[PDB]
Motif scaffolding. Structure first.
Motif: not given
Ligand SMILES: [Mg+2]
Ligand SMILES: [Mg+2]
Length: 755
Positions: A175-177, A185-189, A191, A195
DNA sequence: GGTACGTGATCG
DNA sequence: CGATCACG
């Protein structure tokens, strides 16, 4: 007519329903059985007693429990006909509610088969065997990386990466680039966790492979899922992974799948000083793997610099977990099938428990009443029982290793060694064990010898089918099968002496030792007349060399020697050439260290590679072993210890090498004995630190009066200016104990290792 | 669904 | 000493 992968039970309208999970021509199938009933047996003083006994009652879940039906049955117990009563119950949870009420009864002599889990009862009684056929299973390896800071509560830090791998490749969810082809890459822990759930539901693997997922990956996923208010519907019935208490550690099940945790598997299969994924992968595939330590992962995550290195490590962890799963599962699958219990349970069992499950199934097949497990009293008395050589000192070169284990099943069979044949009354013919004198009746084949003979015959048939097979696929499968039989047959000797065993028999184990010894003395004598020097002998095998001989000559003569002895020894009695070592030394029974020609150090019962020993002790021990095995220099090793202890005396050792780590396993008030890590933990809790089980306490022992607990300090509170570590504690309780056993093999006492 | 094992350190 | 505790 598919392949059984697991079995369990669910409750519906208060009634149990057995679930059989199958793989049928590539498809997941679930069979239901509502008709199988739980039961126990009761041996009564007289048949008349059944009228009072059948009316025994208990309570469970607000409702009273009754014996549903009673059946008089004729069975075999201790190699003798017996009449017992089969007491049927409605629910398996009724058995632990009513069993002691039945045992209490004045007319009940004893109760039997009262601690057999319902799903295992079903598989045995229905004559059902898991892992049968050529059905091809699907696999998925899963791993996670977490943000960790020193001594934090389990689950405080978020999960920062989740990795998985299959034949399609290895992937990372973060959840970091991070710009890598295998990183999603996702937006949060939250998400990232969702996944992983979606990957598992879509790939629908039959097997989920982890490396210590029983204690780390799944408990952590579950703790973070809880904090985040999200479910983990990973079970094929949409259930969440379930934590089971196995010892003081955990075991995680995923319903409709096989959660295959490699950590207990690899620990049993191979011998290593540390079971890091990197050490394990290198041992199996001879390839190096880089480690990225927790502190480097935290720094990269927090700084946002060096994240490509962390994602490559996460990806490799999954990739190698996949490769190790594929390497180790085929043998676990054949052991499952051989003992007739699921891979989940078998992959987590000792050999003794594999034997017990094979015996329990065979007991049902032969109408033999199973003996009970000992009580606390009986278990401890067995641990106390007596059971009535010392290694060559110094450093030896060119060591040959010979294995004796394939000798014992043959001894058990030929001498009919069994608890049911031991000191039988009105016996016509018997075998007497040498020295020990135990008598084993020859009038009927014993339960264990009978089973073993079938096992050994079945292996010979597999081996004969292997020579006459032109198909490389079945040759591979049959090879795992004959190996699984060898592993089970060679576990019986040790099982007779296993204190928790149902068919435990001390006299059986001693008799096998006494008959075995006659062949061991023959091997020893034939080796000694060939110029060999025997350096170490155990009931398991031996180590020998030809003093002052060339390595190829020692090998050639040893390989010739095994070929010769096996041709003299009757039947299936077999000596095995295990290997060759460039150097080695031996301390006592199962306490030795060797080095092979490729430079690998192999030890037994000496190495202290654990977090509750300081780095200074572990570093000094590794250096002493290297000086002896790699340099062939014991004088260098002694000088290493003398230098280290002087340096500790003079406060020349860095405090980071003196930290001890010990886990808090319970609420602080539950401790009876306050060890140093608990004394440190109580002080932290008094400060407002949320001390919880799972927290690992780092401490340093300071100079002072009293026991060590009163002198231990939390590492974060240690100040090199203000605090002075206890040099005497680090010399006498850490460094010298770590090396004194090794050095004793060369004539040194604790006192000889200082100036 | 019964809830590991062998072993070695430290407490009381 | 016997009891308790922890490692992997
Ligand atoms: Mg199960
Ligand atoms: Mg990892």
């Amino acid at each position: 007519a598919g392949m059984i992968i697991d079995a369990d039970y669910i409750t519906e309208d208060g009634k149990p329903i057995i679930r059989i999970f199958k793989k049928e021509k590539g498809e997941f199938k679930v069979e239901y059985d509502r008709t199988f009933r739980p039961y126990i047996y009761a041996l009564l003083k007289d048949d008349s007693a059944i009228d009072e006994v059948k009316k025994i009652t208990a309570e469970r879940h607000g409702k009273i429990v009754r014996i549903t039906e009673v059946e008089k049955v004729q069975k075999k117990f201790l190699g003798r006909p017996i009449e017992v009563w089969k007491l049927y119950l409605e629910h398996p949870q009724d058995v632990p509610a009513i069993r002691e009420k039945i045992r209490e009864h004045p007319a009940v002599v004893d109760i039997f088969e009262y601690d057999i889990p319902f799903a295992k009862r079903y598989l045995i009684d229905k004559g059902l065997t898991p892992m049968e056929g050529n059905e091809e299973l699907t696999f998925l390896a899963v791993d996670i990386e977490t943000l960790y800071h020193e001594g934090e509560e389990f689950g405080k830090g978020p999960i920062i990466m989740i990795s998985y791998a299959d034949e399609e490749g290895a992937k990372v969810i973060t959840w970091k680039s991070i710009d890598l082809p295998y990183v999603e890459v996702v937006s949060s822990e939250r998400e990232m966790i969702k996944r992983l759930v979606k990957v598992i539901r879509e790939k629908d693997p039959d097997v989920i492979i982890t490396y210590n997922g029983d204690n780390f990956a799944f408990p952590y996923l579950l703790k973070r899922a809880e904090k985040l208010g999200i479910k983990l519907p990973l079970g094929r019935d949409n259930s969440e992974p379930k934590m089971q208490r196995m010892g003081d550690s955990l075991a995680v099940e995923i319903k409709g799948r096989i959660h295959f945790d490699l950590f207990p598997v690899i620990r049993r299969t191979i011998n290593l000083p540390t079971y890091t994924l990197e050490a394990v992968y290198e041992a199996i595939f001879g390839k190096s793997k880089e480690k990225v330590y927790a502190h480097e992962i935290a720094e990269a995550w927090e700084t946002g610099k060096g994240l490509e290195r962390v994602a490559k490590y996460s990806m490799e962890d999954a990739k190698v977990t996949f490769e190790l799963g594929k390497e180790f599962f085929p043998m676990e699958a054949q052991l499952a099938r051989l003992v007739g219990q699921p891979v989940w349970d078998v992959s987590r069992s000792s050999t003794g428990n594999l034997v017990e499950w094979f015996l329990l199934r065979k007991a049902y097949e032969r109408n033999e009443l199973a003996p009970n497990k000992p009580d606390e009293r009986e278990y401890e008395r067995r641990l106390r029982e007596s059971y009535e050589k010392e290694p060559e000192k110094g450093l030896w070169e060119g060591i040959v290793s010979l294995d004796f284990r394939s000798l014992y099943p043959s001894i058990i069979i030929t001498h009919n060694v069994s608890p049911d044949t031991l000191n039988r009354e009105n016996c016509k013919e018997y075998d007497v064990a040498p020295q020990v004198g135990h008598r084993f009746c020859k009038d009927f084949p014993g339960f264990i010898p009978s089973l073993l003979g079938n096992l050994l015959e079945e292996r010979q048939k597999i081996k004969k089918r292997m020579k006459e097979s032109k198909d490389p696929v079945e040759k591979k499968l049959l090879d795992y099968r004959q190996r699984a039989i060898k592993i089970l047959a060679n576990s019986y000797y040790g099982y007779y002496g296993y204190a928790k065993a149902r068919w435990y028999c001390k006299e059986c184990a001693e008799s096998v030792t006494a008959w075995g010894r006659q062949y061991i003395d023959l091997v020893r004598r034939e080796l000694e007349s060939r110029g060999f020097k025997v350096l170490y002998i155990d009931t398991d095998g031996l180590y020998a060399t030809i003093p002052g001989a060339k390595h190829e000559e020692i090998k050639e003569k040893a390989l010739k020697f095994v070929e010769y002895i096996n041709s003299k020894l009757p039947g299936l009695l077999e000596l095995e050439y295990e290997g060759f070592y460039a150097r080695g030394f031996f301390v006592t029974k199962k306490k030795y260290a060797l080095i092979d020609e490729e430079g690998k150090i192999v030890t037994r019962g000496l190495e202290i590679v654990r977090r509750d020993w300081s780095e200074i002790a572990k570093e000094t021990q590794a250096k002493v072993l290297e000086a002896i095995l790699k340099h062939g220099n014991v004088d260098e090793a002694v000088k290493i210890v003398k230098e280290v202890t002087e340096k500790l005396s003079k406060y020349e050792i860095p405090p980071e090498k003196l930290v001890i780590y010990e886990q808090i396993t319970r609420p602080l008030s539950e401790y009876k004995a306050i060890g140093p890590h608990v004394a440190v933990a109580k002080r932290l809790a008094a400060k407002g630190v949320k001390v919880k089980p799972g927290m690992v306490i780092g401490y340093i022992v300071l100079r002072g009066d009293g026991p060590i607990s009163k002198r231990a300090i939390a590492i974060e509170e240690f100040d090199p200016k203000k605090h002075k570590y206890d040099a005497e504690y680090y010399i006498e309780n850490q460094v010298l104990p770590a090396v004194e056993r090794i050095l004793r093999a060369f004539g040194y006492r604790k006192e000889d290792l200082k100036y």
